Ligand binder design. Structure first.
Ligand code: MG
Lengths: 64, 165
């Protein structure tokens, strides 16, 4: 597809999440890069509102 | 799981890559994540290019969690098991659906299942690839930045499409 020519190199990634779990509101910001040639993603996420009210692993499929 | 456009599609399967085909205008990704014997997440994300940057913007809503369950009680290990994401076409919406199971390790040695149901629909008006059934093989590693004192996660993930000859 034409869209795939966009992915032949390393692409910077930004992730921004706003969450509310049982009324616990929080935000997460992430940065990193992806290299689809190798199926490879590297990302670092920060909870910008303080402590994350849920375990980090439970957010991997949403943020990663 | 959030930017499945970074999956490696083997050359012989590239006609099945919805995710890249929707770029740069992007796609909406929605999920219901059902934690067995606990609450659920509903997520809505827009994944698209902003200039040369791939952006994933997400709203997450969680309800019905148990105060002392594995999620709000923080009883899950900081690790992650390999899994497959099973994809099928959704022609009625010119997109795709996916289903898969995440097994989160509980600190007592048990497992917390998180059933995932997923739908993706294109944002733009360019043509998109509607795939035959296949899956994404995913491996993920979680770590900490030893100089980071904020609450954080470092993720390394590898994703490869498979399931077609
Ligand atoms: Mg076919």
């Amino acid at each position: 597809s034409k869209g795939e020519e966009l992915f032949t190199g390393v692409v910077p990634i930004l992730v921004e999440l706003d969450g509310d779990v049982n009324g616990h509101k929080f935000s997460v910001s992430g940065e990193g890069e992806g290299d689809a040639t190798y199926g490879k993603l590297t990302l670092k996420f920060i909870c910008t509102t303080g402590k994350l009210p849920v375990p980090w692993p439970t957010l991997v499929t949403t943020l990663g | 799981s959030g930017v499945q456009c970074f999956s490696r599609y083997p050359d012989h399967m590239k006609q099945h890559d919805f995710f890249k085909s929707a770029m740069p205008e992007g796609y909406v990704q929605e999920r219901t994540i059902s934690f067995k014997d606990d609450g659920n997440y509903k997520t809505r994300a827009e994944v698209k290019f902003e200039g040369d940057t791939l952006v994933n913007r997400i709203e997450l809503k969680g309800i019905d969690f148990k105060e002392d369950g594995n999620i709000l009680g923080h009883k899950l290990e900081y690790n992650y098991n390999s899994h497959n994401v099973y994809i099928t076409a959704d022609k009625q919406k010119n997109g795709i659906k996916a289903n898969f199971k995440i097994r989160h390790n509980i600190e007592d040695g048990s497992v917390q299942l998180a059933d995932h149901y997923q739908q993706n629909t294109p944002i733009g008006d360019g043509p998109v690839l509607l795939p035959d059934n296949h899956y994404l093989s995913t491996q993920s590693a979680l770590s900490k930045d030893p100089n980071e004192k904020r609450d954080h996660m470092v993720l390394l993930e590898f994703v490869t499409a498979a399931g077609i000859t």
